[PDB]
Hints:
Two copies of one chain form a homodimer.
Chain A: E1 2-5, E2 8-11, H1 12-15, E3 18-22, H2 31-34, H3 42-58, E4 63-66, H4 76-86, E5 89-91, E6 93-95, H5 102-105, H6 109-121, E7 133-137, H7 144-160, E8 164-167, H8 174-184, E9 192-194, H9 203-211, E10 215-218, H10 229-234, H11 239-251, E11 258-260, H12 275-282, H13 289-300, H14 305-320
Parallel strand pairs in A: 3-4, 4-5, 6-7, 7-8, 8-9, 9-10, 10-11
Antiparallel strand pairs in A: 1-2
Amino acid sequence: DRINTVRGPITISEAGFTLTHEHICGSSAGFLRAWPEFFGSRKALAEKAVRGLRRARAAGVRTIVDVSTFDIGRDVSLLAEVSRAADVHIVAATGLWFDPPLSMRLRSVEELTQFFLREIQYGIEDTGIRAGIIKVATTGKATPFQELVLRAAARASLATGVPVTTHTAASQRDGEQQAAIFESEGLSPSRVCIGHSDDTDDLSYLTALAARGYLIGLDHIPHSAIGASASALLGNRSWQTRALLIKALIDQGYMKQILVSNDWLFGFSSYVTNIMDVMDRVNPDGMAFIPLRVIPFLREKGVPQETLAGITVTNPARFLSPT
Amino acid sequence: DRINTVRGPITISEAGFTLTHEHICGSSAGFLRAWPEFFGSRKALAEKAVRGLRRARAAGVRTIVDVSTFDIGRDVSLLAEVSRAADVHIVAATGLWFDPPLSMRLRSVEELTQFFLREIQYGIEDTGIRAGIIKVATTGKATPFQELVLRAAARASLATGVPVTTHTAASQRDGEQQAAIFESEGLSPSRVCIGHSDDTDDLSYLTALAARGYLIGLDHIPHSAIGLEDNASASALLGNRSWQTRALLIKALIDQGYMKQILVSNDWLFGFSSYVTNIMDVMDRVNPDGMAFIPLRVIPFLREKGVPQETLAGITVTNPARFLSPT
Ligand SMILES: CCOP(=O)(O)OCC
Ligand SMILES: CCOP(=O)(O)OCC
Ligand SMILES: [Co+2]
Ligand SMILES: [Co+2]
Ligand SMILES: [Co+2]
Ligand SMILES: [Co+2]
Ligand SMILES: [Co+2]
C-alpha cells in the first residue's frame, strides 16, 4: 500500500492531509540550473520553500503533490531537499504541460508513453525518484499534440496504476473532451482529476463529471485579483465564490469526488518578472490558505469536520494509491 | 589572446584548425538528463561523440565551436567529458536559438543581457565553464522576442568582446535584418557570423555582407537530401543542393576577394532530438565522415579547383582565431 515520494515510498496512512495540486517552483526545463539568480539564488528559493512548507505543516498539511512536469521545470533534487528540511512529503509528477520543447512536441504517442513510464517505473533523471502522478493540460479544444499527451498519460496510468491530473480552461469546459479521450483509452474516471475546475460557475458541468466518477480539482481557491497581467491570470471572482463550489458539490452528494488545493508556488519564472511578489501580496498564507481560510469557512457554512477530513485525507489517499 | 573552452582558458595559437558551427547533441533544455534513453543512453551518446571527434582530430581538426544554446539542450558537462576524452578543444555557447521556453521568452532585453553575461563572465550552470560565443536565431522575419535576443547578444558582446554567431533562413535573406539590428546597438560587423549562408546561391547577398566586415558561415556543406526525395522530413531540413554546390560558394567568395570573411563548418551532431526520430540515422548515412567532412572531402575539393593551401589554412585557422579572440 505505497505511494512514491521524493524521499522514497510511504504508506497510505503516512500521507495524511494532502494538497493535491501544488508547485515548489513554476519554471521551465533546465531554467533553475542555468539561471538561479532569477530567483535571487537557489539557496534563497530553497529557504523560501522550506518556510512556506513549514507554515503549511503547522496548519495541518503533511503531504503536497508537486504537479510540476518536465516543462514546468521540475527539479526533483530541490523537491527532495525542501521535503527533508520541512518534514513534508512531496509527490513528484511526470507528464507534459503547455510548454513542451521541440524534443517533446515532435514525439509520437508511443514515445511519450515510454517517457512517462520511465519517470514512474525507473526514476526522474539520475535520482531514482519515481513520479507518483501524471500531469497533462489543455487550454480550450485539444491541439493534436495535447491529444497525444492525454493518450500517453492514459496508457502510462493503465500500466502503473498512477493517477492522472489535469490543467483545464474550465470556462471552455475542457473536462468534457479530456474525459472523452481518457475513456476512449479505457481509463477509469476514478484515476483522473479534472483540475482548475473552480474557474467556472457552471455547476451542471462539474456535477456531470463527478457523476461519471471523475475527481474534481477545486485548486485555484486563493487565485483572485480583486482590487493587468495579474488580473488576466488570477481573475475577478472571489475566493469565497470558489470555495462555495466545494459546499455545492457536497450538497449534490459528491464529497468523495472532491480534491482541494492552492496551486501555489515559491518561485515563478514562466510569467512576468515580479509576479511572485504580486501573488505573495494577494495570498500571504501561501499553501496554508486551504487549512487556514477555506476549512474554517466551510465549517461555519455547515460542513462537518468528518466531511472535510474525508476531502483532505481520504480522497487524496484513494486517488494517489496505485490502483 | 585567451579564449574560453570547456577545459578552461587556452591561447589563440593552440586553437589551430577550427570548425566554427558544430554540436555534440541537438536537443532541448533538460532533455538529455530527463530522457537519455532517447539516444540509447548518455554513455552511448558520449562514446559516439568521442569516436567522431577522434576521427575529426586524425583528419586535422583541433577545435570545434559547439553552438548549442540553453534551448538546444547544451549539456556542458557532456561537452567537457567528450572534449577531454577526444583531446579536441570545444568552445561552448550562450545565447538563445528558436525554441526558447516560457521562462526565457517572457524576459526583457536587460534580463536576457544579464543571462548571456552570466554564462560568459561567471559560468554555465554550476560548472564554472564559460561561454566563448553567443548563438542567436531567426527563421525568416524576426519575431519581437528574437529582436530582443539579437539586441541582448550585441550588448553582451560589447561588454565582453565575445563573438556572435547566427542561424538564418538564408533563402529569406535573414542576415540583412540581423545585421541591421546588430549595428543599431553599435556592434562591429567583425564580431558577427551570419550562419547557414550556404543554403542560398544568391552571391549578391553573401558578398554584400562580406564587404561590410561580416563573417560568412558556410556551415551546411554536407547537408544534402539527394537520393532521398521520398523522405519529406529529411528533404525539408537538409535541402536538395549537393555538397559540391555548397562548397563552390567558398571558392566564389575567395575569387571575389573575401578570403578573410569565410568560416567553414559541418553543423554536425551525434544526437538529434529536436526533429523527427529517424533523423540522426538518416544524416549519418548521408555523411559517414561526420565532422571530418571539411578536412577530408572539402579541402581536397578546393585544392583541385585551384585554391592555394595557405588560403584554405587562412580560412580554417586564421579566420576563426580572429573571430573567437575577445576584442
Ligand atoms: C506553473 C503554472 O501552473 P498552473 O497551475 O498552470 O498555473 C496557471 C493555472
Ligand atoms: C539542433 C541543431 O539545429 P540547427 O543546427 O539549427 O539545424 C541543423 C539541421
Ligand atoms: Co495549471
Ligand atoms: Co484559473
Ligand atoms: Co499548477
Ligand atoms: Co541552425
Ligand atoms: Co547548428
